[PDB]
Amino acid sequence: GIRKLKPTTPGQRHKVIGAFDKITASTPEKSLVVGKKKTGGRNNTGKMTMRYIGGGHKQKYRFIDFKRTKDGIPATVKTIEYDPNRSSRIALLYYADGAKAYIIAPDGLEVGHTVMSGSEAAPEVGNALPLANIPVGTIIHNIELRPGQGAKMVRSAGSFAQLTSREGTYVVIKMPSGEVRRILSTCKATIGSVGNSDHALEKSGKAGRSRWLGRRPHNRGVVMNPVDHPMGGGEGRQSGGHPRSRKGLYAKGLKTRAPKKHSSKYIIERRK
Amino acid sequence: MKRTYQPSNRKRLNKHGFRSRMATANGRRVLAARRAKGRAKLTVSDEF
Amino acid sequence: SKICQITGKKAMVGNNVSHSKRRTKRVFDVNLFRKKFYWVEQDCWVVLRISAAGLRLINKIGLDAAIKRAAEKGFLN
Amino acid sequence: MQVILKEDVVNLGYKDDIVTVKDGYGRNFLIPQGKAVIASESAKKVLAENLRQRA
RNA sequence: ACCCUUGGUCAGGUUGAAGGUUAGGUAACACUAACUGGAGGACCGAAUCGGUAAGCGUUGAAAAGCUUUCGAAUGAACUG
RNA sequence: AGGGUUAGUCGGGGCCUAAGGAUAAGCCGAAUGGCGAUCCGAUGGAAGAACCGGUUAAUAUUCCGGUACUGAUAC
RNA sequence: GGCUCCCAA
RNA sequence: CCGGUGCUGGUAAAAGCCCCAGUAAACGGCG
RNA sequence: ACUAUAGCUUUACAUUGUAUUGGAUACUAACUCGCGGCGAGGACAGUGUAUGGUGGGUAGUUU
Ligand SMILES: [K+]
Ligand SMILES: [K+]
Ligand SMILES: [K+]
Ligand SMILES: [Mg+2]
Ligand SMILES: [Mg+2]
Ligand SMILES: [Mg+2]
Ligand SMILES: [Mg+2]
Ligand SMILES: [Mg+2]
Ligand SMILES: [Mg+2]
Ligand SMILES: [Mg+2]
Ligand SMILES: [Mg+2]
Ligand SMILES: [Mg+2]
Known part of the structure; x- marks a missing residue:
């Protein structure tokens, strides 16, 4: 759910935040968290390689x-x-073995x-199964790309993918982006769609919230000025010509995926 | 108004001290040139 | 030390020359790569950073002779 | 490459004979799997001596 | 200038969001009134940060200041 | 020119790690070298532990008079 | 000191 | 408004280019 | 504007092999990647030399 702020201030007139109606605990698990350092977009040489990053609230990383990979061990x-x-x-999960873990x-x-993982697990929401064991047409998320490497594919809030058909060693999956592609049937996926689907309805309201984030x-x-950007310069306002970056890379329709990438053999239909 | 020199002994030694000079090939070049000129004050470590 | 371990080949320095004879500095690089070889005489596997010329010499005179020759000439290390 | 066969190989046979091959077929397959060895002069002389003694 | 890590500072007053409780009300939610609550790049205003307007200074007390006036002052704040 | 700063308990250091830095195994590279997980590195965390009174020209929780406490060590 | 509330956790 | 300009598609020992199609909250025009 | 050039891109040779039916398909052993040998690819890709495009991104200049 979402909570719309009343317009007592101009910085709150257009602010919509989440209702936090699914959260059941406020403290994280101590053994599964660690303090995280920030980068200002600076790489290991100290140079700013990515702009518009800096400051914000201090955060701790959750594992x-x-x-x-705990196949066959039930968890609560x-x-x-x-x-x-x-x-x-x-x-937060408690395994009958006595371990603890965090999952999406x-x-x-x-x-x-x-919840359970492995081939013998029932295809219920929250269970992790190899794609060879998932019934066709199921809504899935957290899709592995290579077997044993960990989920990479469908992870953002509200996002889901669909198992459309299977063709032997590969299954066919429709992606959140609308791409249809083949995934090894020994890769794992979790049943259900990622929660917090109302995350897209939130509005910051003011510049300070972006600074906090x-x-x-x-x-x-x-x-x-022209010395800084190819689109700069001129007396008064000007359109800047064809849109491009500081290095002159066109910003309207020029494709940048490598034309000889091997993975294009597994991509049936493309959509960005 | 605030001027350009705001003293800090730790920063002075970290930036221009003898060990800072010896840690780099160009710092040793500076030390060799100063010895060849015959400076009585080799680095800021010599000052007090 | 990017250098062939069998022949000692390293990068050369030369010029790009345009049609109007403008000359710009350039480097001629060695066709260098890492490859694994089965040493029969010692019955083991070795990894060598070699050029295609070094591979030609190996395929001409055998791996053992090439390695001993390179060690004698100092290229091996 | 020129190789002295140590075993029998289909489509180029005559175990213990000298045959020319492509460099890759013989550096990357035959020698590591044990079929054939490089045809150096010492190996050629040894094989000739063995064939002469068994003749 | 920007960033990173670790610390510190912000007199006093005002306003009164969400939420809650109590009465009425509904098939039930809604919804009305009182009390409570104490949010906010909210208000007035010291420290502090900045530098609007005028006066003065212009071999100046100062190689950019002073006096009055004025902006912000829990934050995209200031500061070691 | 002479004199003047007195600590088991105050402050620091000795111990620990942050940003960052130097490195090992390794990686990269005409050279000089550039990277790279243990060590260094406080602005943070531990420190093993008091006060009262008096006194100098110039020191004091440090000197003195009481009152205490803490750590090691020989029975 | 704890308590309450909040999200930027 | 797709005419112009961009962008996207279908020689040494094939790209391109052509041609056709598309694209204006692309640059641009609205005699 | 003239002339170069980093980068990007095309093809040939090298790295680079085998079989079937040439022009494609298939294979695994070069090579690449993943998990701790096994899995996934595969003579492609990447890299070197040569070569044609593109290239105010950068440079030297002229006007
Ligand atoms: K902007
Ligand atoms: K420019
Ligand atoms: K100040
Ligand atoms: Mg301007
Ligand atoms: Mg104009
Ligand atoms: Mg305010
Ligand atoms: Mg004031
Ligand atoms: Mg105010
Ligand atoms: Mg340490
Ligand atoms: Mg005194
Ligand atoms: Mg120019
Ligand atoms: Mg000149």
């Missing part, structure tokens, strides 16, 4: 189990928690439920 869902590092919520919280997973102001190229 998410994207691999889920303990809490649903806020994670500052991703748009979705996370879930799927839509519909409630505190007190049971750790973004820095972005300057348009047409209001610079």
